[PDB]
Design an enzyme around this catalytic site. Structure first.
Site, PDB file in Angstrom:
ATOM      1  N   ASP A   1     -55.216 -30.712  56.144  1.00  0.00           N
ATOM      2  CA  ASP A   1     -55.668 -29.492  55.520  1.00  0.00           C
ATOM      3  C   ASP A   1     -56.355 -29.950  54.198  1.00  0.00           C
ATOM      4  OD1 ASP A   1     -56.280 -26.966  54.988  1.00  0.00           O
ATOM      5  OD2 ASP A   1     -54.531 -26.424  53.637  1.00  0.00           O
TER       6      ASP A   1
ATOM      7  N   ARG B   1     -59.385 -26.529  47.460  1.00  0.00           N
ATOM      8  CA  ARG B   1     -58.185 -25.981  46.929  1.00  0.00           C
ATOM      9  C   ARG B   1     -57.031 -26.945  47.370  1.00  0.00           C
ATOM     10  NH1 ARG B   1     -59.670 -24.003  51.946  1.00  0.00           N
ATOM     11  NH2 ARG B   1     -58.337 -24.859  53.646  1.00  0.00           N
ATOM     12  N   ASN B   2     -56.955 -28.065  47.896  1.00  0.00           N
ATOM     13  CA  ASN B   2     -55.715 -28.980  47.927  1.00  0.00           C
ATOM     14  C   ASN B   2     -56.025 -30.209  47.084  1.00  0.00           C
ATOM     15  OD1 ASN B   2     -53.795 -27.148  49.428  1.00  0.00           O
ATOM     16  ND2 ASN B   2     -54.889 -27.736  51.210  1.00  0.00           N
TER      17      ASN B   2
ATOM     18  N   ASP C   1     -50.291 -31.808  48.221  1.00  0.00           N
ATOM     19  CA  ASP C   1     -49.752 -31.060  49.428  1.00  0.00           C
ATOM     20  C   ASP C   1     -49.851 -31.887  50.808  1.00  0.00           C
ATOM     21  OD1 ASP C   1     -48.308 -29.161  50.656  1.00  0.00           O
ATOM     22  OD2 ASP C   1     -49.864 -27.959  51.169  1.00  0.00           O
TER      23      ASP C   1
HETATM   24  C1  LIG Z   1     -59.042 -21.898  33.024  1.00  0.00           C
HETATM   25  C2  LIG Z   1     -57.855 -21.174  33.897  1.00  0.00           C
HETATM   26  N1  LIG Z   1     -57.341 -21.977  34.507  1.00  0.00           N
HETATM   27  C3  LIG Z   1     -56.118 -22.526  33.802  1.00  0.00           C
HETATM   28  C4  LIG Z   1     -55.229 -23.552  34.533  1.00  0.00           C
HETATM   29  N2  LIG Z   1     -54.948 -22.842  35.677  1.00  0.00           N
HETATM   30  C5  LIG Z   1     -53.934 -23.674  36.653  1.00  0.00           C
HETATM   31  C6  LIG Z   1     -53.695 -23.410  37.917  1.00  0.00           C
HETATM   32  C7  LIG Z   1     -52.979 -24.067  38.844  1.00  0.00           C
HETATM   33  C8  LIG Z   1     -52.401 -25.033  38.345  1.00  0.00           C
HETATM   34  C9  LIG Z   1     -51.356 -25.872  39.198  1.00  0.00           C
HETATM   35  O1  LIG Z   1     -51.022 -25.332  40.298  1.00  0.00           O
HETATM   36  N3  LIG Z   1     -50.862 -27.235  38.880  1.00  0.00           N
HETATM   37  C10 LIG Z   1     -50.096 -27.999  39.563  1.00  0.00           C
HETATM   38  N4  LIG Z   1     -49.900 -29.295  39.108  1.00  0.00           N
HETATM   39  N5  LIG Z   1     -49.197 -30.086  39.940  1.00  0.00           N
HETATM   40  C11 LIG Z   1     -48.851 -29.367  40.890  1.00  0.00           C
HETATM   41  C12 LIG Z   1     -47.879 -29.642  42.246  1.00  0.00           C
HETATM   42  C13 LIG Z   1     -47.884 -28.684  43.183  1.00  0.00           C
HETATM   43  C14 LIG Z   1     -47.386 -29.103  44.382  1.00  0.00           C
HETATM   44  C15 LIG Z   1     -47.881 -28.883  45.634  1.00  0.00           C
HETATM   45  C16 LIG Z   1     -47.006 -29.012  46.607  1.00  0.00           C
HETATM   46  C17 LIG Z   1     -45.882 -29.661  46.790  1.00  0.00           C
HETATM   47  C18 LIG Z   1     -45.456 -29.849  45.533  1.00  0.00           C
HETATM   48  O2  LIG Z   1     -43.901 -30.535  45.490  1.00  0.00           O
HETATM   49  C19 LIG Z   1     -43.458 -30.925  46.467  1.00  0.00           C
HETATM   50  C20 LIG Z   1     -45.939 -29.566  44.131  1.00  0.00           C
HETATM   51  C21 LIG Z   1     -48.495 -27.501  43.137  1.00  0.00           C
HETATM   52  C22 LIG Z   1     -49.341 -27.077  41.958  1.00  0.00           C
HETATM   53  C23 LIG Z   1     -49.346 -28.065  40.851  1.00  0.00           C
HETATM   54  C24 LIG Z   1     -52.552 -25.493  36.990  1.00  0.00           C
HETATM   55  C25 LIG Z   1     -53.305 -24.860  36.138  1.00  0.00           C
HETATM   56  C26 LIG Z   1     -55.888 -22.165  36.439  1.00  0.00           C
HETATM   57  C27 LIG Z   1     -56.715 -21.583  35.534  1.00  0.00           C
END
Ligand SMILES: CCN1CCN(c2ccc(C(=O)Nc3[nH]nc4cc(-c5cccc(OC)c5)ccc34)cc2)CC1
Length: 289
Positions: free
Chosen positions: A147, A151-152, A165
């Site tokens: 995938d 987005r990933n 992922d």
């Molecule tokens: C300006 C506005 N911005 C500010 C910042 N903001 C975000 C949005 C999303 C994140 C984020 O998701 N960070 C992540 N870091 N590490 C991550 C690992 C997994 C993860 C995935 C699969 C399996 C797993 O374990 C087995 C873990 C998921 C997400 C992760 C950060 C800042 C968006 C808007």
């Protein structure tokens, strides 16, 4: 769960926080981990933590475990989301991985469209190079993503691209072609034809996906085949249709996309080749616009 001293962290070393990934990756939260590295027990590290939900089944559990075990086998690389630890004893399973503070690559690109500093041409190519490197690493470790998409790909505080992922063997024949992403897009639009039609997944079909991701990068987060539904996409691919060259994209980089979308999988480039090509292109690309 059996303990694994290689990875275990006492769960009182973890301060849990807000959710991450809008549910796309299951229940993942931001957390602070005290003394992750035992050499500095008095430092905190921001980390991402994945756990089961309340209404979670037995296979939800086995999947999370498989995910974690897979990540152990694969080992570390700068351009992937790395495993950092686990809480497996005396409470619910916690899988602890690297935190990427700037979110996914699609968002990050879109936020830097002209009306958050614009990205130079060199920056964009450099983004592509890092994603190719992570994929090169994963392929070298015999891992097929299935995938790959902007987005990933997650982005760190220091603007490092990390493939995310990659650890789950998601239920292959069991995939909902009509199911949309968190953003309202259709994941089939990243899938190689042989993966979509014949359910044959390989490093070569990941390379197809990478070409689509390339197209995402140079459209600054554009949506592939906008307005096109599943049935029509199938027809487009049967016919051998290919996405048009984005504006503000060199012929060299468009040729790269087209090569990734080679109708014959054996003829697509490898991630090894793409990394080498992208490395040279970076060094020749101007950052002055
Ligand atoms: C300006 C506005 N911005 C500010 C910042 N903001 C975000 C949005 C999303 C994140 C984020 O998701 N960070 C992540 N870091 N590490 C991550 C690992 C997994 C993860 C995935 C699969 C399996 C797993 O374990 C087995 C873990 C998921 C997400 C992760 C950060 C800042 C968006 C808007």
């Amino acid at each position: 769960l059996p303990e694994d001293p290689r990875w275990e962290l006492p769960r009182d070393r973890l301060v849990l926080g807000k959710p991450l990934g809008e549910g796309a990756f299951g229940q993942v939260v931001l957390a602070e981990a005290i003394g992750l590295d035992k050499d500095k027990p008095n430092r905190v590290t921001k980390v991402a933590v994945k756990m089961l939900k309340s209404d979670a089944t037995e296979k939800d559990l086995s999947d999370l475990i498989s995910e974690m075990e897979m990540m152990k086998m694969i080992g570390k690389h700068k351009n992937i989301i790395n495993l950092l630890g686990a809480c497996t004893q005396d409470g619910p399973l916690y899988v602890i991985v690297e935190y990427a503070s700037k979110g996914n690559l699609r968002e990050y690109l879109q936020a830097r469209r002209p009306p958050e500093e614009q990205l130079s041409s060199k920056d964009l190519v450099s983004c592509a190079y890092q994603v190719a490197r992570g994929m090169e690493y994963l392929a070298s470790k015999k891992c097929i993503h299935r995938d790959l998409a902007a987005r990933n790909v997650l982005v760190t505080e220091d603007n490092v691209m990390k493939i995310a992922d990659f650890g789950l063997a998601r239920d292959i024949h069991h995939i909902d072609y009509y199911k949309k992403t968190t953003n309202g897009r259709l994941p089939v639009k990243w899938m190689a034809p042989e993966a979509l039609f014949d359910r044959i997944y390989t490093h070569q079909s990941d390379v197809w996906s990478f070409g689509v991701l390339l197209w995402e990068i140079f459209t600054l987060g554009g949506s592939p085949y906008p307005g096109v539904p599943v049935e029509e996409l199938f027809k487009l691919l049967k016919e051998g249709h290919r996405m048009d060259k984005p504006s503000n994209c060199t012929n060299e980089l468009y040729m790269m996309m087209r090569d990734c979308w080679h109708a014959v999988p054996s003829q697509r480039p490898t991630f090894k080749q793409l990394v080498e090509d992208l490395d040279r292109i970076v060094a020749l690309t101007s950052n002055q616009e």
